[PDB]
Design an enzyme around this catalytic site. Structure first.
Site, short mmCIF file in Angstrom:
data_model
loop_
_atom_site.label_atom_id
_atom_site.label_comp_id
_atom_site.label_asym_id
_atom_site.label_seq_id
_atom_site.Cartn_x
_atom_site.Cartn_y
_atom_site.Cartn_z
N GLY G 9 0.86 -1.28 0.04
CA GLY G 9 0.17 0.19 0.03
C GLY G 9 0.77 1.32 -0.06
O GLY G 9 0.89 1.69 0.92
N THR G 10 1.38 1.52 -0.98
CA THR G 10 2.47 2.46 -1.21
C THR G 10 1.97 3.77 -1.84
O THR G 10 0.84 3.98 -2.36
CB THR G 10 3.71 1.96 -1.96
N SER G 11 2.87 4.74 -2.08
CA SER G 11 2.73 6.13 -2.93
C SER G 11 3.99 6.12 -4.06
O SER G 11 4.82 6.40 -3.49
CB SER G 11 2.17 7.19 -2.34
#
Lengths: 240, 209, 250, 248, 240, 237, 205, 242, 142
Positions: G9-11
């Protein structure tokens, strides 16, 4: 020869496969085996080499092997290859009984053994079995005696009386002179006597080097003891 | 060959009818664990060694399926020993990490082993976390087990870049002690292993009793 | 070695799935070997649960349902003159017109008869295959095959596919010199049962009133079979002797 | 279908001898001498590092550790020995370590190596290995042991033995210099004396390779903390130690 | 002459030798080219003689020096087809080592791997050995400057310095004399250009002939990369 | 013969198999082994081919235990024999696992003989150059003594010898063996036959291997060198 | 996709600018609501000037990235420095051919002398798209508008740094699965430059 | 000795001198083939082939002795026709695979290495034989013009001018003279004229012969392989005659 | 370029699919006695209720090897996979040890598994037809 005898897959210029003939030559060196069928029985006789003084005789394997309760088998040639062939035949008999609920016929088992021997001639990396076999018995629910001969090449034939092995030509001539197909021995005793007399033509010592096995219909296989064979030999000598 | 799948259908038919920490310090790494071994709510063993040796200077501690953890650790240790003999060199932590990652990924998470691996090699000191499905991560301080939250709280309270050997040992011991006090899964003792660059590994059994 | 090079020399054929010999044979690309197999090749879905797939997709609007054989009463029994097989010949009606009489008894060969129950296609296909096997066996052995051997062949065949979806129940009846008259019952569960009297289908209890003795004449046996079928309820009659089966019709 | 088989590369001669095994033995007899001596408290294994002058002697080692308590040396063809050593190290783990949790005893590992060598004579694809191995070891229930393994796969235990170019003279010297009360240091001295008569050129610590199976070495374990963890018993003497023993 | 089945395959002669291996060794000198390898303080230098007598050849495409990985370079003595075969195999081996073990392959480990492959060739009847000699050079992160050599027999070993070719004896003798004078196993220089100049001078003195910029190939391995010099670099090095 | 002896799968024009004959001939170069079956046990004896005093005599080159009831004496190549011995041990344990009973001697002998026969029918395999003397006990036939050779044939015996001096040893056994012999008399006969047939000056203990299968159950005893010395002193050799 | 598996769950952001390309990401790895690692490095190097960021299953993406790095080493041993397009093609083939068993998405940023900086995105499924800039991860959904209003072609290095910093700061602000520090790699003809920005800096933007 | 007795009856066998005689016999087979030449000009390659006059029954446009591997690669071979066709098919496959994988036409050195590895692999086992063809190929890539010659042993090299076949010695002498007389270089059209002249000199022959010329030039054919049209071919033939 | 093995399920079945155990009496049917599987194992039961990881584990090494060969083909050319496959075929073809099951040293060298151990190495593992002659017949295809 002439360079045409170094492989199983080579035809001679006159149309021969010499390695098959050489396997037959190997068969010719084994002890003699005889098969004679009468009106209601089949008798297999075998020559045994004289037992040594210190050789144990209780557990020595017999020359006549029971493939099934109704089919027996004798051989001439290499003793060690015969064990492999006999094991395969017994396995096939049980497999056929399991698959079709019916025991094999004599001709079917002969064809299977011939097929195994033929298969072992179809590769340059394998050696054929140097064994010729005599298969005797009665078809299930039948009373007609059956006797067959199988060769290392995979060819099988049906005979009224046949001999294989060392000095088999003399025994074959004796059988041809003293056997009539239209009037076969009508009793077990006559067939056994004829078989013993045929074996005595090449056996040196006599009774102690002769094995006799009798097969009748309805799965009746008997291996005659030394005393009965000795009695037959003594009667033959007295009548001589 | 390999692990067998026999009696899988039969077993289906029949069915139908810990605190671990790792801390880096300025010249090495430390791994620590508790010694309580349980079978459900029952304490099976009050003194159980959970620190395992992949290689003389590479150690690890695991959680999940205990048999899987032990078996995977031993298999990787055998591979590491053979590779070190083949190359005539000291084994590296990166190599053990690669072997573990690929082996765990091959089985698609069906081998339930979660590991903390610490070690010292000629390239330096290393600390890694390894997940059952094959993912790996790097860190300066790591926690694992049912008591990992309390230990991580302690580690976040008292961790800094310039840590000596004694400070690192005390911090790891305090984290394990917090997991001991506040988690029903831990509680008996503290086992420590210190791996320092250029020296032999030091295995302290029951450092805190 | 050049074969290896060809294996590593190049996509389109891979997507067509025609790099596999079985796919080429099934689509008759390289010849008609597909129609030359003594043991038929049966397609299965390449998934983890073929059985569940088939069961779900068979138990559900148009006329494309798998045809089921008649549940009509069938009787088979044995006496000193041979075997009597009687089948109630009431024909079901649909959106079709029959060209001639519809046979509920499969003639495996001029000496063997089988009875259909369950899946019509399974019974027809596998009894024709059994007839081919029996013909090959008789050619090889130069003798007529016994009923036990043929029934065992069919039983082994259906047992190899047990649980896949086959549904069939048949009675193999035959008269040989060695065995006399013989009746076996073989179903898709692998059971193989030798017997004297068999009654299968709806009304089997009423037809099981067979007055039965091993001294009945041919006419008496035919009359008894006809009466048993009528009590179960036209009737189709077969008389199997050592020389083959004879169809009477009644 | 003539490519589904290959005829045997090792066959019997009319006299009853396997020619390839005899020729491999001949190749072994042309190799550098290697010896082994068994004492009451250790075993010594020695060899000559015959070589180019620009080649680094430490890079190539003819003595290999198989297990922490088992080492080996060879006479014959180097690459075959290297392959066999890799295989033996792997087999010690596959067959014993991952099953019983222990390293194998000396005799069982020797048997595994011998089986691997024997399988090379029943083959249509490979010729037999051209090496003879000396394997020394220690185990809990059998003490110290020394074995010799031949290219045919036959192996025998020895009190002391030698193989290679000067095997006969070395065997005579060992027969005249061996007793059942010998100590490990005496065995090392006798090994140095025996190797002195075989080496033709420079005889120093840079042309001799020595290894011992003796007492446990805690300093080579690499970690401390477990009293029951025994250190390795295999130890390879350095060039300085060999020089010191030669000077004395 | 092998005088038997050893004329084709690698089996033992009655003297205990493998003639195909020795003949591959003889094949290693077909190109009639000499190569030299020396070690500096933090670099390794390889120099290979280039002979292009034909005027129709493109000299830029004539090379026996290969880049195996980022840090490993290789020099081959023998025919160019086997050389390219070995080069591709070595590249694949180095990449696979990096993928499998997580760090760059050392020069000595790669040499041992190639030697094991050569052992396979020596022992298998249906595989022939490659008639080349391989020399791997690098600056290993643990061992510093490194030279290792492998031969068709499967033998490999490391060297302080090495020479290979028909005139290798004189070059080796000159190297031994220089090392005895200096009493060190490496060259005491800080820049790889000086080591290159020293190796060029040593080759010229040993062979007794003068070399131009187009008659030699130079490869230099540092701790970062292995790289091959061009014609301008060699011409600059000659002027000293 | 040179045109028909390079491969094991080719018959000669006379029907002979030369590789098998050469394997049989190779047995004559091995040390002598003797098996003697008495009324209450079996004795196995063998002579080592030792040439040096540096050999570890105390610590197994001629006598092996297939299982608690069956042992063997070996004449020929040691490594091939070890392969076959491991195979026989595995087969015996398999039979015990399958039937919960000890394997009969003849079944094990026949299995090994079939393996050796099969190794004479594939072009990529050479025959095993070994001969075995099997000594065993079973509940079907009691005490049993068998021999097997490279050709795959096996034979039953009361007294038998294999190896270098088979002819003379067999002659002596024929002249001396008796059916009602005891275990001690069999031991003395085997030792005297070995001493007479030896090519060495004396029959010392370090050149001998001895084993006995007897009853108290059935016990296997592989004699230690001290026991061999004691029996040699007792006999008078 | 697998039960009890670590997700990403990254950016992730990648922006092409006048002198090359810049790849930026956050440093948060979470297991449900618990933060498993707050200083993780998400900038994966597969070649000296070819970098990537990963989304989906962590194990699957790590395995794919390792295979891609091995493939690029093999390619370099033959033909020298590979192009960004070649690496993107290898990534796409690995993702597409295994899409029934692995869950993987990759953003690839590269520089080479011929193409002068390129960005490729391979979302779940295995399709490939070449873009002037790309965003990915759970936190990207909150910055779709802002980026569309603030991207310009041929921006300078500092302007690109500011754009990425602002966008990732907003993504961290609104996404619970994103947080920590902002890590960037700048790939140009001059070389590779690594940058890090701390929460106390970008939270005051 | 050119005949190695006892070491020439199986492939992948070393002689006591370290030679492989089957490869040498394949070279002998090559040396009896038709003469083919290649010339490397300033920015391109030119291939020239001498061919025998056949029956009128052959379709004139379906009989081409110069093969096109890719739009930028030209190739000719001397030796066994089926071996040449097989090698050309392999080269086309390699070029297509490279172009599909990396979206660019394959560079000439990479193509040469792939062909050389494939040819060398056939000198490793006794179950195959070496190719009986020598191949002269070339083309234009981003680095310029390249001309290569590949032999049955798998050895290949880059050439300023290459020749193969029966008349290889005279053609090589003419190529060496051309290189000597043009140190600065040579243009594509001058290369075509010289190739025609060299083929004519080498042929000088039973009844008659024909000449095929192909070229690839950056300035002339935009880096593409094209056959020489009627006007230029006639001009080259006239220049060669006089 | 596969990682997890694919296309593992069977698409067609027949009663004679196992050519090595076909009945001699009925060649279209298998020989249950020589199968030695317990006598009550129809082939259809092998198509259902399998562990999902079994196919992945059984074909893992082959899949990795095929991916390596495809990479070699893409980067080096056809010749490199051709040579690797030829070497492996030559090594595997000439090895025939009916009394052993362990792999050869040369095979492990070719597979780069000289110093690698997996569970297949640790755990490498009748009345009818388990002898040398059955292996001879299977090897020679007679």
């Amino acid at each position: 020869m002439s360079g045409y005898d170094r492989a199983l897959s080579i035809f001679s210029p006159d149309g021969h496969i010499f390695q098959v003939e050489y396997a037959l030559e190997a068969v010719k060196r084994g002890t003699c085996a005889v098969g004679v069928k009468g009106k209601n029985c089949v008798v297999l006789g075998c020559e045994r080499r004289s037992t040594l003084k210190l050789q144990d005789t209780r557990i020595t394997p017999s020359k006549v092997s029971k493939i099934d309760s109704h089919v027996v088998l004798s051989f001439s040639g290499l003793n060690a290859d015969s064990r492999i062939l006999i094991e395969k035949a017994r396995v096939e008999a049980q497999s056929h009984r399991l698959t079709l609920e019916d025991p094999v016929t004599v001709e079917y088992l002969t064809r299977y053994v011939a097929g195994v021997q033929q298969r072992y001639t179809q590769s340059g990396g394998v050696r054929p079995f140097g064994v010729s076999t005599l298969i005797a018995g009665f078809d299930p629910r039948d009373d007609e005696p059956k006797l067959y001969q199988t060769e290392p090449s995979g060819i099988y034939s049906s005979w009224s009386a046949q001999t294989i092995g060392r000095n088999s030509k003399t025994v074959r001539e004796f059988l041809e002179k003293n056997y009539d197909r239209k009037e076969p021995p009508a009793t077990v005793e006559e067939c056994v006597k004829l078989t013993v007399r045929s074996l005595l033509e090449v056996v040196q010592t006599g009774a102690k080097n002769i094995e006799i096995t009798v097969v009748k219909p309805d799965s009746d296989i008997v291996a005659l003891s030394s005393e009965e064979i000795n009695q037959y030999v003594t009667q033959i000598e007295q009548e001589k | 060959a390999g692990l067998s799948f026999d009696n899988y259908q039969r077993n289906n038919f029949l069915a139908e009818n810990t605190t671990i920490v790792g801390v880096k310090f300025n010249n090495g790494v430390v791994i620590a664990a508790d010694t309580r071994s349980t079978q459900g709510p029952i304490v099976a063993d009050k003194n159980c060694a959970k620190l395992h040796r992949i290689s003389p200077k590479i150690w690890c501690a695991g959680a999940g399926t205990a048999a899987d953890t032990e078996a995977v650790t031993q298999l990787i240790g055998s591979n590491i020993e053979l590779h070190s003999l083949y190359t005539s060199r000291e084994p590296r932590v990166v190599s053990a990490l690669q072997m573990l990652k690929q082996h765990l990924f091959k089985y698609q998470g069906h081998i339930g082993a979660y590991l903390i691996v610490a070690g010292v090699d000629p390239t330096g000191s290393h600390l890694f976390s390894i997940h059952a499905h094959g993912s790996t991560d790097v860190g300066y301080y790591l926690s694992l087990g049912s008591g990992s939250l309390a230990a991580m709280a302690v580690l976040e309270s008292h961790w800094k870049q310039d840590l000596t050997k004694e400070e690192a040992i005390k911090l790891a011991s305090d984290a394990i002690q917090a997991g001991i006090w506040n988690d029903l899964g831990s509680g008996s003792n503290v086992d420590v292993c210190v791996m320092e660059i250029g020296k032999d590994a030091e295995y302290l059994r029951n450092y805190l009793t | 070695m050049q074969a290896i090079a060809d294996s590593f020399s190049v996509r389109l054929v891979k997507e067509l799935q025609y790099d596999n010999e079985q796919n080429l044979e099934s689509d008759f690309v390289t010849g008609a070997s597909q129609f030359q197999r003594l043991a038929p090749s049966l397609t299965v879905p390449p998934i983890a649960s073929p059985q569940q797939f088939l069961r779900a997709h068979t138990d559900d609007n148009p006329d494309c349902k798998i045809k089921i054989a008649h549940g009509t009463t069938t009787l088979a029994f044995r006496f000193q003159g041979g075997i009597i097989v009687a089948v109630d010949s009431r024909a079901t009606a649909g959106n079709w017109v029959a060209s001639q009489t519809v046979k509920k008894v499969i003639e495996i060969n001029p000496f063997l008869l089988g009875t259909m129950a369950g899946g019509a296609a399974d019974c027809q296909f596998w009894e024709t295959w059994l007839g081919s096997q029996c013909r090959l066996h008789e050619l090889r052995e130069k003798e007529r095959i016994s009923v036990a051997a043929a029934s065992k062949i069919l039983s082994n065949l259906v047992y190899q596919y047990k649980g896949a979806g086959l549904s069939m129940g048949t009675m193999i009846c035959g008269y040989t010199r060695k065995e006399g008259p013989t009746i076996y019952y073989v179903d898709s569960d692998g059971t193989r049962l030798k017997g004297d009297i068999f009654c299968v289908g709806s009304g089997q209890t009423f037809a099981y009133g067979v007055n039965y003795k091993w001294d009945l004449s041919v006419e008496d046996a035919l009359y008894l079979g006809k009466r048993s079928i009528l009590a179960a309820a036209s009737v189709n009659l077969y008389h199997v002797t050592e020389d083959g089966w004879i169809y009477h019709g009644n | 279908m003539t490519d589904r088989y290959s005829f045997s590369l090792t066959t019997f001669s009319p006299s009853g001898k396997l020619g390839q095994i005899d020729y491999a033995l001949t190749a072994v007899k042309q190799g550098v001498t290697s010896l082994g001596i068994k004492a009451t408290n250790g075993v010594v294994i020695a060899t000559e590092k015959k070589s180019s002058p620009l080649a680094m002697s430490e890079t190539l080692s003819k003595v290999s550790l198989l297990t922490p308590d088992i080492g080996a040396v060879y006479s014959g063809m180097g690459p075959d020995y290297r392959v066999l050593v890799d295989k033996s190290r792997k087999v010690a783990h596959t067959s014993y370590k991952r099953i019983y949790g222990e390293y194998p005893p000396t005799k069982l590992l020797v048997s595994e190596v011998a089986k691997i060598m024997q399988e090379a004579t029943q083959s249509g694809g490979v010729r037999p290995f051209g090496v003879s191995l000396l394997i020394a070891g220690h185990d809990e229930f059998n003490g110290f042991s020394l074995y010799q393994v031949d290219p045919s796969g036959s192996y025998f235990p020895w009190k002391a033995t030698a193989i290679g170019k000067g095997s006969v003279a070395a065997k005579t010297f060992l027969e005249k210099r061996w007793n059942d009360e010998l100590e490990l240091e005496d065995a090392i001295h006798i090994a140095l004396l025996t190797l002195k008569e075989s080496v033709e050129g420079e005889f120093n610590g840079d042309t001799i390779e020595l290894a011992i199976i003796g007492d446990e070495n805690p300093d080579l374990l690499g970690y401390t903390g477990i009293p029951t963890d025994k250190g390795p018993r295999f130890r390879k003497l350095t060039s300085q130690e060999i020089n010191d023993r030669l000077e004395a | 002459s092998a005088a038997g089945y050893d004329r084709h395959i690698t089996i033992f002669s009655p003297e205990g030798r493998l003639y195909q291996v020795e003949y591959a060794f003889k094949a290693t000198n077909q190109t009639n080219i000499n190569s030299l390898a020396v070690r500096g303080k933090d670099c390794t230098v390889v120099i290979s003689q280039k002979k292009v007598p034909d005027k129709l050849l493109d000299p830029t495409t004539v090379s026996y020096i290969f880049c195996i990985s980022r840090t490993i370079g290789m020099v081959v003595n023998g025919p160019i087809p086997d050389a390219r075969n070995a080069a591709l195999r070595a590249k694949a081996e180095a990449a696979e080592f990096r993928y499998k073990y997580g760090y760059d392959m050392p020069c000595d480990v790669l040499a041992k791997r190639m030697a094991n492959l050569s052992q396979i060739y020596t022992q298998r009847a249906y595989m022939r050995p490659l008639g080349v000699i391989l020399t791997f050079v690098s600056v290993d992160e643990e061992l510093g400057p490194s030279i290792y050599k492998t031969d068709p027999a499967g033998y490999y070993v490391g060297y302080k310095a090495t020479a290979t070719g028909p005139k290798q004896q004189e070059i080796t003798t000159n190297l031994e004399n220089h090392f005895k004078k200096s009493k060190i196993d490496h060259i005491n220089e800080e820049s790889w250009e000086k080591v290159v100049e020293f190796a060029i001078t040593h080759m010229i003195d040993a062979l007794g002939t003068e070399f131009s910029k187009n008659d030699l190939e130079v490869g230099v391995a540092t701790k970062d990369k292995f790289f091959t010099l061009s014609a301008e670099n060699i011409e600059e090095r000659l002027v000293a | 013969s040179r045109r028909y002896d390079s491969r094991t799968t080719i018959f000669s024009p006379e029907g002979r198999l030369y590789q098998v004959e050469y394997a049989l001939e190779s047995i004559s170069h091995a040390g002598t082994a003797i098996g003697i079956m008495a009324s209450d046990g079996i004795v196995l004896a063998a002579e080592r081919k030792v040439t040096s005093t540096l050999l570890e005599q105390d610590t197994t080159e001629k006598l092996y235990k297939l299982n608690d009831k069956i042992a063997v004496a070996v004449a020929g190549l040691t490594a091939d024999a070890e392969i076959l011995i491991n195979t026989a041990r595995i087969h015996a344990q398999n039979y015990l696992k399958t039937y919960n009973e000890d394997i009969p001697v003849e079944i094990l002998v026949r299995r090994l003989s079939d393996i050796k026969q099969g190794y004479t029918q594939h072009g990529g395999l050479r025959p095993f150059g070994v001969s075995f003397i099997y000594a065993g006990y079973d509940d079907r036939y009691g005490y049993q003594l068998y021999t097997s050779n490279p050709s795959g044939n096996y034979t039953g015996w009361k007294a038998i010898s294999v190896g270098a001096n088979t002819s003379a040893a067999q002659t002596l056994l024929q002249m001396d063996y008796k059916d009602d012999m005891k275990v001690d008399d069999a031991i003395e006969l085997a030792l005297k036959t070995l001493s007479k047939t030896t090519d060495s000056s004396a029959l010392t203990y370090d050149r001998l291997e001895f084993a006995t299968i007897r009853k108290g159950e059935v016990y296997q005893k592989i004699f230690k060198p001290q026991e061999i010395k004691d029996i040699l002193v007792k006999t008078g050799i | 996709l697998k039960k009890g598996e670590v997700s990403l769950g990254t950016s992730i952001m990648a922006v092409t600018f006048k002198d090359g390309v810049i790849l930026g990401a956050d440093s948060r790895t979470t297991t449900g609501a618990y933060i498993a690692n707050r200083v993780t490095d998400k900038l994966t190097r597969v070649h000296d000037k070819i970098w990537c960021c990963r989304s989906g299953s962590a194990a699957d993406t790590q395995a794919i990235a390792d295979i891609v790095q091995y493939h690029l080493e093999l390619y370099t041993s033959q033909y020298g420095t590979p192009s960004t397009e070649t690496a993107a093609s290898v990534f796409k083939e690995l993702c597409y051919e295994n899409k029934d068993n692995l869950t993987a998405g990759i953003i690839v940023a590269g520089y080479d002398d011929k193409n002068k900086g390129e960005v490729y995105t391979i979302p779940l499924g295995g399709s490939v798209h070449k873009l002037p800039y790309a965003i990915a991860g759970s936190g990207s959904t909150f910055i779709y508008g802002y980026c569309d209003k603030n991207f310009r072609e041929n921006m300078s290095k500092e302007e690109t740094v500011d754009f990425i910093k602002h966008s990732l700061s907003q993504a961290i602000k609104w996404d619970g699965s994103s947080g920590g520090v902002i890590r960037m790699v700048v790939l140009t003809a001059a070389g590779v430059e690594r940058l890090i920005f701390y929460p106390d800096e970008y939270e005051q933007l | 000795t050119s005949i190695g007795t006892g070491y020439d009856l199986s492939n992948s066998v070393f002689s006591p001198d370290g030679r492989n005689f089957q490869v040498e016999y394949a070279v002998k087979a090559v040396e009896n083939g038709t003469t083919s030449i290649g010339i490397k000009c300033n920015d391109g390659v030119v291939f020239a082939v001498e061919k025998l006059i056949t029956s009128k029954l052959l379709v004139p446009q379906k009989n081409v002795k110069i093969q096109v591997v890719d739009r930028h690669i030209g190739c000719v071979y001397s030796g066994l026709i089926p071996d040449g066709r097989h090698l050309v098919n392999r080269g086309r496959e390699e070029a297509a695979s490279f172009k599909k994988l990396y979206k660019t036409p394959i560079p000439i050195p990479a193509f040469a290495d792939r062909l050389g590895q494939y040819v060398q692999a056939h000198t490793l086992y006794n179950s195959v034989r070496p190719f009986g063809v020598s191949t002269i190929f070339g083309g234009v890539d981003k680095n310029g013009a390249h001309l290569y010659m590949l032999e049955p042993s798998g050895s290949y090299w880059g050439y300023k001018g290459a020749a193969t076949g029966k008349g290889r010695q005279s053609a090589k002498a003419e190529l060496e003279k051309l290189v000597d007389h043009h140190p600065e270089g040579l243009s594509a059209r001058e290369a075509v004229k010289q190739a025609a002249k060299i083929i004519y000199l080498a042929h000088e022959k039973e009844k008659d012969f024909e000449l095929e010329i192909s070229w690839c030039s950056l300035s002339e054919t935009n880096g593409l392989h094209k056959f020489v049209k009627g006007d230029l071919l006639q001009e080259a033939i006239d220049f060669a005659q006089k | 370029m596969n990682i997890v093995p694919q296309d593992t399920f069977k698409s067609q079945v027949s009663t004679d699919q196992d050519k090595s155990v076909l009945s001699s009496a009925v060649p279209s049917l298998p020989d249950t006695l020589r199968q030695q599987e317990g006598g009550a194992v129809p082939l259809s039961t092998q198509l259902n209720d399998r562990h999902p990881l079994e196919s992945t584990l059984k074909n893992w090494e082959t899949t990795q090897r095929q991916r390596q060969m495809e990479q070699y083909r893409q980067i080096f050319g056809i010749a490199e996979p051709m040579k690797r496959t030829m070497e492996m075929e030559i090594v595997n073809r000439t090895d025939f040890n009916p009394l052993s099951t362990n792999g050869s040293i040369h095979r492990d060298i070719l597979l780069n598994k000289e110093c690698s151990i997996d569970w297949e190495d640790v755990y490498p593992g009748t009345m009818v037809g388990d002898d040398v002659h059955s292996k001879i017949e299977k090897q020679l295809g007679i």
